[PDB]
Scaffold this active site. Structure first.
Site, PDB file in Angstrom:
ATOM      1  N   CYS A 127       5.341  -4.747   3.629  1.00 34.04           N
ATOM      2  CA  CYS A 127       3.846  -4.910   3.698  1.00 34.04           C
ATOM      3  C   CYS A 127       3.450  -5.598   4.579  1.00 34.04           C
ATOM      4  O   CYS A 127       3.674  -6.837   4.931  1.00 34.04           O
ATOM      5  CB  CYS A 127       3.773  -5.901   2.138  1.00 34.04           C
ATOM      6  SG  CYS A 127       2.040  -6.157   2.131  1.00 34.04           S
ATOM      7  N   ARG A 171       0.762  -9.392   4.034  1.00 31.96           N
ATOM      8  CA  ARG A 171       1.162 -10.643   3.543  1.00 31.96           C
ATOM      9  C   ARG A 171       0.607 -12.111   3.665  1.00 31.96           C
ATOM     10  O   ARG A 171       0.907 -12.912   3.051  1.00 31.96           O
ATOM     11  CB  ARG A 171       2.577 -10.808   3.273  1.00 31.96           C
ATOM     12  CG  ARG A 171       3.458  -9.725   2.532  1.00 31.96           C
ATOM     13  CD  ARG A 171       4.798  -9.890   2.667  1.00 31.96           C
ATOM     14  NE  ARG A 171       5.258  -9.334   4.023  1.00 31.96           N
ATOM     15  CZ  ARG A 171       6.596  -9.354   4.423  1.00 31.96           C
ATOM     16  NH1 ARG A 171       7.484 -10.222   3.931  1.00 31.96           N
ATOM     17  NH2 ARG A 171       6.628  -8.703   5.782  1.00 31.96           N
ATOM     18  N   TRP A 220      -6.077  -3.933  -0.294  1.00 29.97           N
ATOM     19  CA  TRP A 220      -6.939  -3.009   0.226  1.00 29.97           C
ATOM     20  C   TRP A 220      -6.269  -2.267   1.255  1.00 29.97           C
ATOM     21  O   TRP A 220      -5.309  -2.415   1.593  1.00 29.97           O
ATOM     22  CB  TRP A 220      -8.250  -3.949   0.643  1.00 29.97           C
ATOM     23  CG  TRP A 220      -7.811  -4.960   1.520  1.00 29.97           C
ATOM     24  CD1 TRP A 220      -7.499  -4.928   2.830  1.00 29.97           C
ATOM     25  CD2 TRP A 220      -8.162  -6.435   1.195  1.00 29.97           C
ATOM     26  NE1 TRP A 220      -7.447  -6.143   3.569  1.00 29.97           N
ATOM     27  CE2 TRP A 220      -7.728  -7.029   2.633  1.00 29.97           C
ATOM     28  CE3 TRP A 220      -8.210  -7.064   0.269  1.00 29.97           C
ATOM     29  CZ2 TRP A 220      -7.788  -8.459   2.639  1.00 29.97           C
ATOM     30  CZ3 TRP A 220      -8.229  -8.501   0.318  1.00 29.97           C
ATOM     31  CH2 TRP A 220      -7.985  -9.176   1.509  1.00 29.97           C
TER      32      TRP A 220
HETATM   33  C1  HEM Z   1      -4.276  -7.655   1.159  1.00 31.16           C
HETATM   34  C2  HEM Z   1      -4.152  -6.250   1.208  1.00 31.16           C
HETATM   35  C3  HEM Z   1      -2.847  -5.633   1.387  1.00 31.16           C
HETATM   36  C4  HEM Z   1      -2.696  -4.991   2.656  1.00 31.16           C
HETATM   37  C5  HEM Z   1      -3.639  -4.865   3.723  1.00 31.16           C
HETATM   38  C6  HEM Z   1      -1.603  -4.364   2.537  1.00 31.16           C
HETATM   39  C7  HEM Z   1      -1.036  -3.239   3.362  1.00 31.16           C
HETATM   40  C8  HEM Z   1       0.152  -2.493   3.173  1.00 31.16           C
HETATM   41  C9  HEM Z   1       0.513  -1.261   3.652  1.00 31.16           C
HETATM   42  C10 HEM Z   1      -0.292  -0.914   4.907  1.00 31.16           C
HETATM   43  C11 HEM Z   1       1.607  -1.019   3.272  1.00 31.16           C
HETATM   44  C12 HEM Z   1       2.275   0.407   3.389  1.00 31.16           C
HETATM   45  C13 HEM Z   1       1.837   1.541   2.418  1.00 31.16           C
HETATM   46  C14 HEM Z   1       2.623   2.917   2.924  1.00 31.16           C
HETATM   47  O1  HEM Z   1       3.061   2.990   3.929  1.00 31.16           O
HETATM   48  O2  HEM Z   1       2.585   3.655   2.099  1.00 31.16           O
HETATM   49  C15 HEM Z   1       1.889  -1.994   1.931  1.00 31.16           C
HETATM   50  C16 HEM Z   1       3.200  -2.031   1.310  1.00 31.16           C
HETATM   51  C17 HEM Z   1       3.490  -2.733   0.351  1.00 31.16           C
HETATM   52  N1  HEM Z   1       2.779  -3.894   0.121  1.00 31.16           N
HETATM   53 FE1  HEM Z   1       0.976  -4.387   0.660  1.00 31.16          FE
HETATM   54  N2  HEM Z   1      -0.961  -4.729   1.307  1.00 31.16           N
HETATM   55  C18 HEM Z   1      -1.807  -5.613   0.703  1.00 31.16           C
HETATM   56  C19 HEM Z   1      -1.374  -6.300  -0.551  1.00 31.16           C
HETATM   57  C20 HEM Z   1      -0.325  -6.171  -1.671  1.00 31.16           C
HETATM   58  C21 HEM Z   1      -0.141  -6.709  -2.627  1.00 31.16           C
HETATM   59  C22 HEM Z   1      -1.292  -7.407  -3.730  1.00 31.16           C
HETATM   60  C23 HEM Z   1       1.134  -6.429  -3.031  1.00 31.16           C
HETATM   61  C24 HEM Z   1       2.079  -6.990  -4.071  1.00 31.16           C
HETATM   62  C25 HEM Z   1       1.604  -8.045  -5.104  1.00 31.16           C
HETATM   63  C26 HEM Z   1       1.751  -5.848  -1.861  1.00 31.16           C
HETATM   64  C27 HEM Z   1       3.096  -5.311  -1.943  1.00 31.16           C
HETATM   65  C28 HEM Z   1       3.655  -4.307  -0.982  1.00 31.16           C
HETATM   66  C29 HEM Z   1       4.601  -3.554  -1.276  1.00 31.16           C
HETATM   67  C30 HEM Z   1       5.919  -3.833  -2.376  1.00 31.16           C
HETATM   68  C31 HEM Z   1       5.092  -2.798  -0.216  1.00 31.16           C
HETATM   69  C32 HEM Z   1       5.775  -1.584  -0.437  1.00 31.16           C
HETATM   70  C33 HEM Z   1       5.221  -0.234  -0.658  1.00 31.16           C
HETATM   71  C34 HEM Z   1       6.236   1.017  -0.766  1.00 31.16           C
HETATM   72  O3  HEM Z   1       7.364   0.597  -0.546  1.00 31.16           O
HETATM   73  O4  HEM Z   1       5.707   2.146  -1.116  1.00 31.16           O
HETATM   74  N3  HEM Z   1       0.797  -5.415  -0.963  1.00 31.16           N
HETATM   75  N4  HEM Z   1       1.038  -2.937   1.861  1.00 31.16           N
HETATM   76  C1  CYN Z   2       0.480  -3.000  -0.398  1.00 30.37           C
HETATM   77  N1  CYN Z   2       0.099  -2.408  -1.409  1.00 30.37           N
END
Ligand code: HEM
Ligand code: CYN
Ligand code: HEM
Ligand code: H4B
Ligand code: H4B
Ligand code: ARG
Ligand code: ARG
Ligand code: CYN
Ligand code: ZN
Lengths: 419, 419
Positions: free
Chosen positions: B118, B121, B290
């Protein structure tokens, strides 16, 4: 058993068995993954004091011999067995052994073939090998290196080549090139604090100056060759300018690109790696391929730690250089890459764009699984520094492992040298 | 001891000690590195038949309790000890245990904080948590999900949130969302062979159709919610259209971009992961953040395996679409990314460009080493799909490891479901 590898762009699958031949250990723990480390111990082969112990050399030599005789279309068992016996006796009686010319040629190509961070391995069978295992003096190295550069540049029609110097013996008579690459630019830290030229070669440039080289304080001053023969102290050698081919940068549409005064050399030639084969180690074996547009256009010119020219190219394109969210960097970086490709092509210097290179590698990888059930690959190095997702390499899962023969890194010579 | 991590853009170094807390094992062997595998076992938490064995649950719960009480600025030992004892007795007498609301809130944020893939974070402390551990029916899940979507969309002012459903018991009464994300488009394989809509959801879309959903064969048909409550069979739920916010794509300079008819939803909400905390497992806990411009502009629209619109955008820009070496893809991809950012901003939908996100993450990472000597990070996922080298994340070495709490992947429910 094997390891399933999938390409998310085509749902295609491959089975990796070649990873079983994995030498020793990589650099990822049982828990952690250090896959993004640049120079991990697993990829380095350091200095020595005594000759490589027989207990460990003998088995390696046997593997390589078998590997070599196993590559022929039609086996030559009798010769296979004769060679094993000979090498065995030689190591047992002399404490080491010499490779035949054909074994060395095979080894340099296999090592190239086993280089996980190289995007251009589809060319692995085309490699000019210069045998300088006879060399004994610094001046002779210099000569071999000049011959190599002249052959490899070929007036713009770049040809891949490698020069192999004497193998390591007791480790106290190592042959070494103190240079990062054969041809590189000097970097100077000016009084004011600003850096002039290529910042990446500050330590080395400063070293040359200490060895008597005259700093010309330019922005593109070709560094001198610093050669170490037979564990002897390094000797500085200016490279005959006629031998150094350079490309001056100009954009096909922006006439002001020329006004930036950029230029780069045509020959990318790694000069400081170690070639390992059947237990033997060659700490001096300069090799070269040809350039991939992004190495110069993206890394060499745009890297903040290098010529850092993005900001300037941005202003000159009239982009919102102070609004990161505008994606101006994305636009400038592309114009720089177009200039680089355009320039090399206009001056007939071999060069390849990253998309073509990417598709090319994907072809190599397929041939490899199909030829020996595997292909070590470092995703992090194989994905171009821009347009990642747009290239097929990005959607290809891959396994990274150290085979043999192999090109290892080394500790900077000026840190382990007994003056 | 620690692990030295360097940033080649600034020569800066960091010491990683947090990797010692590494749960079990990653997916890289002692020899090979499987760091580019998308869904490795190490990152997956599969189905069950019996409740998690006490011998293994008890120690995990203890770790989490300690972890929780150790995060306060001012320790509350007495409460710390009371809680340990209580949980211990509960697990020992009931075969499991319930988390307090505050422990759950802490856990969801830590898990987010421990998500190596992510990029956003730095927002970890800002997370709305919806406690639906009370839920028992499919219709109630549907309701919680609708409330979540409405709160998270907030009419364009996206707010991060997570909804936690009942924890796993014996594994035969699991709560599950069969969807990849809450909101996604349907993909249909037409008779002729061509795919209509998002190819990535073919298997799932086909599944919905089997469950009675009426395929509208559109190019942007929001899929239905397929909910599984108490190990019960899944029930289909259309999402109230008023709740689904969508952004129509238009370029700020190319009026023909609009004519492409592209649109995307505003809420990225992963719906199929499992939240693990102190031995407990929540197989149903949809969350959202987002968007980052490149997810839609680069991956969703340009991925050959998705809407594959590059070629078309290229023709319409009049580029040498048949000369890969011209770098037309590089140009088109940038115009698409500008349209995406422009569109979201014009319709006031929260969104972030990859450069800003990159710099943002780099700030988070520094705070993390400075707060707990570490920050698990997956370089391969953290480097944007374009402009890689232009972002600071690219020059940052990092270590990837699985901590706890953590968000794990799961086997597609329709493959392990007893109908
Ligand atoms: C503030 C907004 C956030 C942004 C800008 C963000 C952005 C991202 C991006 C760019 C990815 C890659 C997705 C992909 O490549 O398909 C990702 C993955 C991930 N994010 Fe975030 N994230 C945010 C919020 C969150 C939240 C609230 C959580 C959990 C409470 C979280 C948990 C994760 C996890 C678990 C992944 C792995 C997803 C996967 O393996 O398919 N993210 N995030
Ligand atoms: C990060 N969903
Ligand atoms: C046909 C031309 C070739 C092309 C297009 C090519 C391209 C590349 C590129 C793009 C890199 C990355 C360099 C960097 O990121 O700084 C690389 C790395 C590498 N290549 Fe090649 N290569 C070619 C020929 C060769 C040859 C002839 C050898 C050896 C016999 C070789 C061995 C390697 C090795 C060892 C690396 C790793 C370098 C390092 O870690 O610094 N390549 N190559
Ligand atoms: C930290 C990270 O390993 C480092 O920046 C790597 C990423 N990928 C790379 N890839 C290539 N080809 N060359 C490099 O120098 C790098 N640098
Ligand atoms: C094969 C490789 O692991 C795969 O293509 C990865 C690369 N990096 C990624 N990074 C992000 N953020 N998302 C992805 O889906 C991927 N795909
Ligand atoms: N294509 C090659 N052979 N590259 C070798 C490394 C060159 C390095 N990227 C400079 O510039
Ligand atoms: N920024 C996020 N929360 N992304 C979650 C995954 C979204 C996915 N890249 C689609 O599009
Ligand atoms: C490749 N050098
Ligand atoms: Zn690894």
């Amino acid at each position: 058993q094997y390891v399933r590898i999938k390409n998310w762009g085509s749902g295609e699958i491959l089975h990796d068995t070649l990873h079983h031949k994995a030498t020793s250990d990589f650099t990822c723990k049982s828990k952690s993954c250090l896959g993004s480390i640049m120079n991990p111990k697993s990829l380095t082969r350091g200095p020595r004091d005594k000759p490589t112990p027989l207990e460990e050399l003998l088995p390696h030599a046997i593997e390589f011999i078998n590997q070599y005789y196993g590559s022929f279309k039609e086996a030559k068992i009798e010769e296979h067995l004769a060679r094993l016996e000979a090498v065995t006796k030689e190591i047992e009686t002399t404490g080491t052994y010499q490779l035949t010319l054909d074994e060395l040629i095979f080894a340099t190509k296999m090592a190239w073939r086993n280089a996980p961070r190289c995007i251009g391995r589809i060319q692995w069978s085309n490699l000019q090998v210069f045998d300088a295992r006879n060399c004994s003096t610094a001046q002779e190295m210099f000569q071999h290196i000049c011959r190599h550069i002249l052959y490899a540049t070929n007036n713009g029609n770049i040809r891949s080549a490698i020069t192999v110097f004497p193998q390591r013996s007791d480790g106290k008579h190592d042959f070494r090139l103190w240079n990062s690459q054969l041809i590189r630019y000097a970097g100077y830290q000016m009084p004011d604090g600003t850096i002039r030229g290529d910042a990446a070669t500050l330590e080395f440039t400063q070293l040359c100056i200490d060895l008597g080289w005259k700093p010309r304080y330019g922005r593109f001053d070709v560094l001198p060759l610093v050669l170490q023969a037979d564990g002897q102290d390094p000797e500085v050698f200016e490279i005959p300018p006629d031998l150094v081919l350079e490309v001056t940068m100009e954009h096909p549409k922006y006439e002001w690109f020329q006004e930036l005064g950029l230029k780069w050399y045509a020959l990318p030639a790694v000069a400081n790696m170690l070639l390992e084969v059947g237990g033997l180690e060659f700490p001096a074996c300069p090799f070269n391929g040809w350039y991939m547009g992004t190495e110069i256009g993206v890394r060499d010119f745009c890297d903040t730690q290098r010529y850092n020219i993005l900001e300037e190219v941005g202003r000159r394109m009239g982009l919102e250089t102070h609004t990161l969210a505008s994606l101006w960097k994305d636009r400038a970086v592309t114009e720089i890459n177009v200039a680089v490709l355009h320039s090399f092509q206009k001056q007939n210097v071999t060069i390849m764009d990253h998309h073509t290179a990417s598709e090319s590698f994907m072809k190599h990888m397929q041939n490899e699984y199909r030829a020996r059930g595997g292909c070590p690959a470092d995703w992090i190095w194989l994905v171009p520094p821009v347009s990642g997702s747009i290239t097929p390499v990005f959607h290809q899962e891959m396994l990274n492992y150290v085979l043999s023969p192999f090109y290892y890194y080394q500790i900077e010579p000026w840190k382990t040298h007994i003056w």
